[PDB]
RNA sequence: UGAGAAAAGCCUUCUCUAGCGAUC
């Protein structure tokens, strides 16, 4: 007589999020011994997913939002209006450092969103905590600087100087000067492999294992100057743009690109892919912004013609896309629930003091870092960052003992170079041809005068 | 870290989600509960542990249970008790077990656990809790008493409670409290069986099973008070009056030569015409007392009989008092009465306006104890009320009798009488003799009354001469200097220089410890019309250095209280 | 291996209960921490009775 | 970073961020820089390549 | 306009005291934890390597017999007591915890071919080539007296 | 030995023990 008899139900959609079994296949099994194992496999998967569905209540934060009223357009809303209507905590995160004596700046946030490091064209190198306004180090290397990146924790950062590649501590003391990596223009770090991928002006892509200190691969792209590069965090492959209009997929194991994708009628100047690995964003000389579907189809989902050129691109963790055109930035936002960004009308606009030279989103905050000739600015972007973070993976609020314990766990785990492929789950599949080769060996052990002719 | 905490929160999730399904609690309430539960969980999983954290956790869970219980009745939903209520109860039981394991020595935590088990837990859990308590805390008979009490009044099991009592006696063979409660317990068992027969073995129904305890307990504990104590519980039970009769008869025969037994027989006999009816009862009780006197002539027996007569007097009055003198004279002649009871009768007589018997008690006391000065004071108060002209004789006799020099109340009393009915020169003569006799700390009160007399008998000039002589006899008090300053204020002159001169002397003696004296000095410079308030800067500076320890803090607070209007 | 031990002390008598122990390798470098470390000792041994003098 | 435990050291042997002898030869190169104060790292390399060129000619002759 | 930005309360995310331990929120989102197959494979491979490092089966060796061991019998009630029988005819009782020999008896002449322990554990049975079946007492003989079946 | 040698103040990286925690 109790009005509701059953136990508490869980939403189907959240359960489907924690599922890794291909229900699509209709594989036949006519043996009971196979049947018992398969039913257990579904039972183990079903039980584990359900517990995670209930655990959604543990999540405590909510993503930001920004809507106009009475038909206001969000494009014309400026940063000054936002700072006044937002609390003192987030208002302190917006600041504009003005350093015009040195050249245009390239900025990189750490994987943990607490630290920021930047490098100047004329030779200014500095790393700082940006939440609190403290300066970790400030040095001036005599040569020009083309790129800067963090290596895993904030301790080490690699600077792409004029001649070779250099390694510095967080306190400014020089450690390594790698002469093999020469005239490199772009740098990017693979976190879970401890591989640093370098693109050089001479046309070579080089991989370095920062854990052991050995160069695993040095590949000749065979396309001339290399200036456009990005990685897919889900896929771990490297994308390389060329003046031909093609983007090449690379892995350290192969000596030839995994695939070539023709994206533009002219030269490509930017490439960026989302965290989930579903979409790619590219821009080129034909002033077209394109969104590509990386789940097997490789068709351009969205297209738009622009007055100026999108020099740089980036994605947040919620799916927002920002394009840096001249001295103006524009952010496109969409619902993102299994849909690409909608390029119909931009979400926010802002005009910088100088031309844009670098864009990147903070990992777990609603701010955007823009590097330009005038200096470095921090915008406020409501709805861009992921609200809830995992404590054992990336804590902004972590002590030293938490950090040094975490690093060894990642080092005990390090992925070999050759396992990088287009499918991150390719290790699950059985190698079909070796099955056939093995079966070959298994088989091996187991009228009247016409006759006179 | 939060591995165990996360396990516990995911264990706590299903009942919260069911509560959401009920409609009892809204989703925001569930979020707040999860937040506070995580905050409290982080407290009790640390490497450093405190009892306050366990108590806070238990209190939060109890408050949540009460809130749920209140809301269910309003909603009217009574299903799914097991999913929520029992889950919370097991979690609280685990917390209590861990806390009790950490702190075995704390009985108060054990009693909190017992109370929670009574309120919310199954009776078998409470049985296990009592067993665990009695395992390590067997040396406290009160715990055995509570454990046995729970069996009878709650579980209604008389036999199980008997074994808990019987085992308790082997651990504590000499505790009288265990015997009395066990004696009471069996008589309770008799009442249950008597009502049992009415609703529908003969020997137990008579109370024989309790009578066995009485004989054995008397043998182990050979005391008069204990045997009388067992009777008190026996009278409380109406049934089996023979049991009360049997024990009462044994009181006289077995217990003799002790005053308490004879007294109890007397008070039992105690238990306008009705006033006469009271009268013969008092005589019958008295006759018992003399029968005890010839059998037992010890001193202790007498006082119970004088105190009996004293109580009847204070509570017709003439007949009661006529008893008092006759028993007083009889006790006095055998000299057994002690000093203290002489005073008690004497003061009672004074309050009832009877001034001829009080003299007899006073005179009788002095001849027995000539050295005792307190009864000498008692005699003096009698003659003052009597107004007899023998006051002068009394002081001469007392001081000759009092060989020790220190008789402080006598010295004061002589000063009081001499002022009333003697010349002023003799009063000064008495005071000067007193200051010679007493040289130590007792002179403090002597000097204060000397100065007060000087202002009354003389004027301001006379007080000045007395103050000048005594300003060097070092044992002092602050009342000596407060009196002198007060006399200066009342005079019309109010020489402000003399005001400072007295305060400096007072601050020289008691400045190290007296915060109030420094405060009073500062207000004089302000409020007095002749004062110089520009000295207040220096007095505060001087006050800080001489004051030591806690007095330094009090002066600061009082002055800060003085700057505000609260004073 | 559940067994009871009687320990006699100047303050009184104590009765204790043993839950589990690795008997064979007890006198070994790694296993000896079972009794030495206070936390691990509390895991395997409890105080069930105490009667002081 | 932290001092590695006994079981950790076996699996994380040859892992050292600070010393990479095979790839850049920094430790041996440092001693030359300090012993004779060389302002720029380029100055040492131009010396090193040139010395090799002299050595090649002597071997070939 | 309606605006909100993510604003964490520091007291939620930071411990209160030096005595307290750091609080760690956990998110089980698959997007935050990629590479689930390759990451777990390395942990499994490292697990097998560790097992090979710590594989140390040998514990101790007991000596004292003067001829080859032929029979063994474990004691039902106590883990630490075993019995052995050698070719010379002697039977030795061993204390496993102390790694020494408690008693040595000359049970038979010639080989001993079998030893078994009575289920209660106060006696054992031995058989030798002298065509005899002998029962003995598990408890050691008192003081210095010689043992008898 | 040869980032010459000698002294004071600020950050960074790490090492040892000793309690503490595991009793539900």
Swiss-Prot record, chain B:
GO terms for cellular component: chromosome; nucleolus; nucleoplasm; Pwp2p-containing subcomplex of 90S preribosome; small-subunit processome. SUPFAM superfamilies: TPR-like. GO terms for biological process: maturation of SSU-rRNA from tricistronic rRNA transcript (SSU-rRNA, 5.8S rRNA, LSU-rRNA); ribosomal small subunit biogenesis. SMART domains: HAT. Keywords: Nucleus, Repeat, rRNA processing. InterPro entries: HAT, TPR-like_helical_dom_sf, Utp6, UTP6_C, UTP6_N. Its main location: nucleus. HAT repeats lie at residues 121-153, 156-188, 280-311, 458-490, 494-527. It is found in: Nucleus, Nucleolus. GO terms for molecular function: snoRNA binding. Pfam families: U3_assoc_6 (PF08640), UTP6_C (PF24892). Belongs to the UTP6 family. Part of the small subunit (SSU) processome, first precursor of the small eukaryotic ribosomal subunit. During the assembly of the SSU processome in the nucleolus, many ribosome biogenesis factors, an RNA chaperone and ribosomal proteins associate with the nascent pre-rRNA and work in concert to generate RNA folding, modifications, rearrangements and cleavage as well as targeted degradation of pre-ribosomal RNA by the RNA exosome. Involved in nucleolar processing of pre-18S ribosomal RNA. Part of the small subunit (SSU) processome, composed of more than 70 proteins and the RNA chaperone small nucleolar RNA (snoRNA) U3. This is U3 small nucleolar RNA-associated protein 6 homolog. It comes from Homo sapiens (Human).
UniProtKB/Swiss-Prot annotation, chain C:
It is found in: Nucleus, Nucleolus; Cytoplasm; Nucleus, Nucleoplasm. Coiled coil: none annotated. It is linked to Spinocerebellar ataxia 36: A form of spinocerebellar ataxia, a clinically and genetically heterogeneous group of cerebellar disorders. Patients show progressive incoordination of gait and often poor coordination of hands, speech and eye movements, due to degeneration of the cerebellum with variable involvement of the brainstem and spinal cord. SCA36 is characterized by complicated clinical features, with ataxia as the first symptom, followed by characteristic late-onset involvement of the motor neuron system. Belongs to the NOP5/NOP56 family. Part of a large pre-ribosomal ribonucleoprotein (RNP) complex, that consists of at least 62 ribosomal proteins, 45 nonribosomal proteins and both pre-rRNA and mature rRNA species. Within this complex directly interacts with TCOF1 in an RNA-independent manner. Core component of box C/D small nucleolar ribonucleoprotein (snoRNP) particles; the core proteins SNU13, NOP56, NOP58 and FBL or FBLL1 assemble stepwise onto the snoRNA. Interacts with NOP1 and NOP58. Interacts with NUFIP1, RUVBL1 and RUVBL2; RUVBL1:RUVBL2 seem to bridge the association of NOP56 with NUFIP1. This is Nucleolar protein 56. It comes from Homo sapiens (Human).
Swiss-Prot record, chain D:
This is U3 small nucleolar ribonucleoprotein protein IMP3. It is found in: Nucleus, Nucleolus. The chain holds residues 2 to 62 of 184 of the full protein. It comes from the Eukaryota. Part of the small subunit (SSU) processome, composed of more than 70 proteins and the RNA chaperone small nucleolar RNA (snoRNA) U3. Component of a heterotrimeric complex containing IMP3, IMP4 and MPHOSPH10. Interacts with MPHOSPH10. Component of the 60-80S U3 small nucleolar ribonucleoprotein (U3 snoRNP). Required for the early cleavages during pre-18S ribosomal RNA processing. Part of the small subunit (SSU) processome, first precursor of the small eukaryotic ribosomal subunit. During the assembly of the SSU processome in the nucleolus, many ribosome biogenesis factors, an RNA chaperone and ribosomal proteins associate with the nascent pre-rRNA and work in concert to generate RNA folding, modifications, rearrangements and cleavage as well as targeted degradation of pre-ribosomal RNA by the RNA exosome. Belongs to the universal ribosomal protein uS4 family.
From Swiss-Prot, chain E:
Expressed in the endometrium during decidualization. Expression is down-regulated in preeclampsia decidual tissues. Signal peptide: none annotated. It is found in: Nucleus, Nucleolus. The modification N6-acetyllysine is found at residue 49. WD repeats lie at residues 64-104, 107-146. It comes from the Eukaryota. Part of the small subunit (SSU) processome, composed of more than 70 proteins and the RNA chaperone small nucleolar RNA (snoRNA) U3. Component of the DCX(DCAF13) E3 ubiquitin ligase complex, at least composed of CUL4 (CUL4A or CUL4B), DDB1, DCAF13 and RBX1. Interacts (via WD40 domain) with DDB1. Interacts with ESR1 and LATS1. Belongs to the WD repeat DCAF13/WDSOF1 family. Part of the small subunit (SSU) processome, first precursor of the small eukaryotic ribosomal subunit. During the assembly of the SSU processome in the nucleolus, many ribosome biogenesis factors, an RNA chaperone and ribosomal proteins associate with the nascent pre-rRNA and work in concert to generate RNA folding, modifications, rearrangements and cleavage as well as targeted degradation of pre-ribosomal RNA by the RNA exosome. Participates in the 18S rRNA processing in growing oocytes, being essential for oocyte nonsurrounded nucleolus (NSN) to surrounded nucleolus (SN) transition. This is DDB1- and CUL4-associated factor 13. It comes from Homo sapiens (Human). The lineage of its organism: Eukaryota, Metazoa, Chordata, Craniata, Vertebrata.
């Amino acid at each position: 007589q109790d009005p509701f008899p059953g136990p508490a139900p869980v939403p189907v959609e959240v359960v489907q999020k924690f599922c890794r079994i291909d229900k699509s296949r209709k594989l036949p099994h006519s043996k009971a011994k196979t049947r018992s194992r398969l039913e257990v496999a579904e039972a183990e998967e079903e039980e584990t997913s359900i517990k995670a569905a209930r655990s959604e209540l543990l999540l405590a934060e909510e993503p930001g939002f920004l809507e106009g009223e009475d038909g206001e357009d969000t494009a014309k809303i400026c940063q000054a209006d936002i700072v006044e209507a937002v609390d003192i905590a987030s208002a302190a995160k917006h600041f504009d450092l003005n350093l015009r004596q040195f050249g245009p700046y390239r900025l990189n946030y750490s994987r943990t969103g607490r630290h920021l490091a930047f490098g100047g064209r004329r030779g200014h190198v500095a790393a700082l905590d940006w939440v609190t306004k403290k300066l970790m180090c400030e040095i001036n290397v005599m040569e020009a600087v083309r790129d800067i990146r963090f290596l895993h924790s904030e301790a080490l950062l690699a600077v792409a100087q004029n001649r070779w590649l250099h390694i510095y501590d967080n306190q400014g003391i020089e450690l390594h000067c790698i002469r093999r990596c020469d005239r490199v223009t772009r740098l990017e770090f693979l976190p879970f492999h401890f591989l640093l991928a370098t693109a050089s002006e001479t046309g070579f892509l080089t991989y370095l294992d920062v854990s052991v200190g050995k160069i695993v691969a040095a590949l000749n792209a065979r396309a001339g100057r290399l200036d456009v590069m990005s990685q897919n965090p889900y896929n771990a492959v490297i994308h390389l743009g060329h003046s031909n209009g093609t983007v090449s997929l690379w892995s350290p194991a192969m000596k030839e690109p995994l695939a070539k994708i023709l994206c533009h009628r002219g030269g490509v100047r930017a490439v960026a892919v989302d965290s989930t690995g579903t979409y790619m964003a590219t821009s080129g000389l034909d002033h077209q912004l394109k969104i590509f579907d990386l789940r097997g189809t490789y068709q351009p989902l969205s297209t738009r013609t622009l007055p100026h050129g999108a020099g740089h691109l980036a994605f947040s963790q919620r799916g927002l896309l920002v394009a840096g055109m001249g001295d103006v930035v524009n952010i496109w936002a969409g619902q993102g629930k299994a849909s690409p960004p909608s390029l119909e009308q931009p979400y926010l606009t802002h005009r910088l003091s100088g031309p844009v030279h670098g864009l990147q989103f903070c990992p777990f905050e609603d701010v955007l870092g823009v590097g330009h000739t005038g200096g470095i600015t921090s915008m406020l972007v409501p709805g861009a960052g992921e609200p809830n973070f995992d404590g054992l993976e990336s804590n902004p609020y972590r002590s030293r003992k938490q950090r040094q314990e975490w690093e060894v766990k990642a080092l005990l785990e390090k992925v070999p170079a050759e396992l990088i492929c287009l499918d991150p789950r390719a290790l699950a599949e059985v190698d079909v041809i070796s099955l056939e080769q093995g079966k070959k060996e298994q088989i091996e052990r187991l009228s009247a005068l016409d006759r006179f002719v | 870290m939060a591995e165990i905490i996360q396990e516990r929160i995911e264990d706590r999730l299903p009942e919260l989600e069911q509560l959401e399904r009920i409609g009892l609690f809204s989703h925001a309430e569930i979020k707040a509960i999860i937040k506070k539960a995580s905050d409290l969980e982080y407290k009790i999983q640390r490497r450093t542990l405190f009892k306050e954290d366990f108590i806070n956790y238990v209190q939060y869970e109890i408050n949540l249970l009460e809130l749920i219980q209140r809301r269910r009745t309003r909603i009217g939903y009574s299903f799914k008790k097991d999913e929520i209520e029992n889950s919370i109860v097991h979690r609280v039981q685990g917390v209590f077990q861990r806390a009790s394991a950490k702190w075995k020595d704390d009985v108060q935590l054990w009693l909190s656990y017992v109370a929670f088990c009574k309120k919310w837990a199954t009776k078998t859990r409470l049985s296990k809790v009592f067993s665990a308590m009695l395992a390590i805390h067997s040396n406290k008979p009160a715990l055995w008493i509570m454990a046995a009490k729970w069996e009878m009044e709650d579980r209604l099991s008389s036999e199980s409670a008997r074994q808990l009592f019987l085992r308790a006696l082997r651990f504590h063979p000499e505790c009288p409290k265990l015997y009395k409660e066990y004696f009471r317990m069996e008589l309770m068992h008799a009442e249950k069986l008597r009502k049992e027969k009415e609703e529908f073995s003969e020997e137990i129904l008579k109370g024989e099973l309790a009578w066995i305890i009485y004989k054995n307990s008397v043998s182990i504990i050979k005391g008069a008070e204990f045997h009388v104590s067992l009777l008190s519980i026996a009278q409380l039970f109406d049934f089996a009056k023979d049991l009360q009769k049997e024990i009462y008869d044994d009181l006289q025969a077995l217990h003799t030569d002790d005053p308490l037994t004879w007294d109890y027989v007397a008070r039992r006999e105690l238990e306008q015409a009705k006033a006469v009816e009271v009268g013969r009862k008092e005589e019958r009780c008295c006759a018992v007392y003399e029968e005890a006197v010839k059998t037992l002539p010890t001193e202790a027996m007498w006082k119970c009989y004088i105190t009996f007569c004293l109580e009847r007097f204070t509570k017709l009055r003439g007949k009661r008092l006529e008893r008092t003198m006759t028993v007083f004279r009889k006790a006095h002649e055998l000299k057994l009465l002690s000093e203290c009871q002489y005073k008690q009768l004497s003061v009672s007589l004074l309050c009832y306006n009877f001034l001829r018997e009080a003299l007899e008690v006073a005179v009788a006391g002095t001849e027995l104890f000539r050295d005792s000065g307190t009864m000498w004071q008692l005699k003096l108060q009698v003659l003052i009320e009597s107004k007899s002209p023998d006051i002068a004789m009394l002081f001469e006799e007392a001081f000759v009798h009092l060989k020790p020099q220190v008789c402080l109340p006598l010295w004061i009393s002589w000063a009081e009488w001499s002022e009333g009915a003697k010349s002023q020169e003799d009063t000064e003569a008495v005071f000067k003799k007193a200051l010679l006799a007493v040289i130590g700390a007792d002179s403090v009160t002597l000097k204060n009354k000397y100065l007060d007399w000087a202002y009354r008998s003389g004027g301001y000039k006379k007080a000045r001469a007395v103050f000048k002589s005594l300003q060097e006899s070092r044992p002092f008090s602050v009342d000596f200097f407060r009196k002198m300053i007060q006399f200066e204020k009342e005079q019309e002159s109010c020489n402000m220089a003399n005001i400072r001169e007295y305060y400096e002397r007072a601050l020289r003696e008691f400045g190290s410890a007296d915060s109030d004296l420094w405060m009073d000095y500062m207000k004089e410079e302000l409020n007095h019309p002749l004062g110089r308030p520009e000295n207040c800067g220096q007095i505060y500076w001087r006050a800080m250095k001489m004051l030591q320890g806690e007095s330094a803090e009090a002066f600061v607070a009082k002055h800060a209280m003085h700057q505000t209007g609260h004073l | 291996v559940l067994l009871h031990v009687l320990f006699e002390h100047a303050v009184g008598y104590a009765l204790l209960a043993l839950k589990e122990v690795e008997e064979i390798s007890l006198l070994q470098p790694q296993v000896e921490e079972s009794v030495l470390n206070l936390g691990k000792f509390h895991s395997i041994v409890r105080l069930v009775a105490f009667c002081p003098f | 970073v932290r001092k590695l435990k006994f079981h950790e050291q076996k699996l994380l042997k040859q892992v050292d961020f600070l010393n990479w002898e095979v790839t850049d030869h920094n430790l041996h190169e440092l001693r030359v820089l300090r012993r004779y104060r060389l302002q720029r790292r380029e100055d040492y390399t131009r010396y090193n390549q040139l010395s090799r060129a002299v050595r090649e000619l002597a071997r070939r002759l | 306009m309606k605006v909100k930005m993510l604003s964490r309360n520091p007291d939620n995310y930071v411990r209160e005291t030096k005595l307290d331990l750091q609080r760690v929120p956990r998110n089980y989102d698959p997007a935050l934890h990629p590479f689930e197959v390759p990451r777990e494979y390395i942990r499994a491979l490292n697990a097998t390597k560790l097992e090979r490092v710590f594989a140390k089966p040998f514990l101790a060796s007991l000596d004292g017999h003067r001829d080859g061991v032929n029979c063994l019998a474990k004691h039902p009630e106590k883990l630490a007591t075993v019995l052995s029988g050698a070719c010379d005819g002697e039977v030795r009782i061993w204390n496993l915890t102390q790694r020494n020999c408690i008693r040595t008896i000359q049970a038979h002449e010639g080989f001993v071919r079998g030893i078994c322990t009575r289920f209660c554990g106060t006696s054992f049975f031995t058989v030798g080539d002298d065509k005899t079946v002998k029962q003995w007492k598990m408890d050691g003989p008192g003081y210095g007296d010689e043992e008898e079946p």
